[PDB]
Structure 1
């Protein structure tokens, strides 16, 4: 199923996710719906809290053939180094992009879709994607890094877009 993605300024985007107790068929359903939703809106990453499911689950797929699926359940940042930034987007902040400071390299521990643990070292776009999605799980958005003026301007942009998109 395709789930509805929340937009700012929805307050449910600020909730802190609980860890997944047990990776069972209900969780695997959520993972599958999250991928379906992410591909349907043309995203490369999605956190559970974006679809109003407040558990520590993330899906990523940067591939163009939509077949290098990455699932992070209960991710844990083990180490990070360096600093970078690209203009990030987000399905919760429609059509807005902004450069945000990130670590360049990241090492995480997570569970996969089967509930088996794995470690992953990432750099480049992947490292940035993981950090952006892990932020979502503790109620952080990429706009939080920007000036108050930039933040307001982003909010207004989105509110205006949702105002027009709802036609009637």
Structure 2
């Protein structure tokens, strides 16, 4: 079932998510709920923090056919290298896009939907997405990389956007 995505400014988006102790039926319901929300909104990824569930859970789908589900529970970065960047967007920062500096290659270790571990070597958009979604788990948004002036403009714009759409 579709969940509500928090927009800035909301302090809840800055709460550090805690590690999932045991992957079970509940955790899995959340995973499916998260995928439903992400597909509903046409997003390519979604961190649990965005839907107000403070646990280390991420769902991703960077495929054209939008049928390739990637689940990262308790992700952990092991390696990262190179430089890249794209006009990133976020469902928590409606209508704002900004070029953010990211590592091109990224190697991670996580748990899947069934609580079994795997390691993944990613590059391209998938690597960028993962760094984006992991920042979300530690209360960091893509706007924190910009200059304070640009950040302030963003908050003004979203603040306005939301109030007028209510």
Using the size of structure 2 for normalisation, the TM-score is 0.98
Name whichever of 60-69 and 17-26 sits farther off. Answer: 60-69
Q: Cα deviations across residues 96-142 of structure 1 (Å, max 9, x unaligned)?
A: 10011111100000000011100000001110000000000000000
Alpha-carbon distance in 2 for matches of 1:95, 1:121: 31
In the TM superposition, residue 42 of structure 1 has moved relative to its aligned partner by 0.9
In the TM superposition, residue 63 of structure 1 has moved relative to its aligned partner by 2.0
Q: Cα deviations across residues 51-110 of structure 1 (Å, max 9, x unaligned)?
A: 000000000112233210000000000000011111111110011100111111000000
Q: What number of residue pairs does the alignment pair up? A: 166
In the TM superposition, residue 160 of structure 1 has moved relative to its aligned partner by 1.3
Corresponding residue of 2:24: 24
In the TM superposition, residue 21 of structure 1 has moved relative to its aligned partner by 0.3
> What secondary structure sits across from 2:125 in the alignment?
helix
Alpha-carbon distance in 1 for matches of 2:79, 2:160: 40
Alpha-carbon distance in 2 for matches of 1:106, 1:8: 28
Alpha-carbon distance in 2 for matches of 1:42, 1:153: 25
Alpha-carbon distance in 1 for matches of 2:151, 2:117: 37
Q: Which ranges in structure 2 are unaligned for 5 or more consecutive residues?
A: none
Q: Which ranges in structure 1 are unaligned for 5 or more consecutive residues?
A: none
Cα RMSD, aligned residues only = 0.8
Dislocated runs of 4+, deviation >4 Å: none
In the TM superposition, residue 164 of structure 1 has moved relative to its aligned partner by 1.6
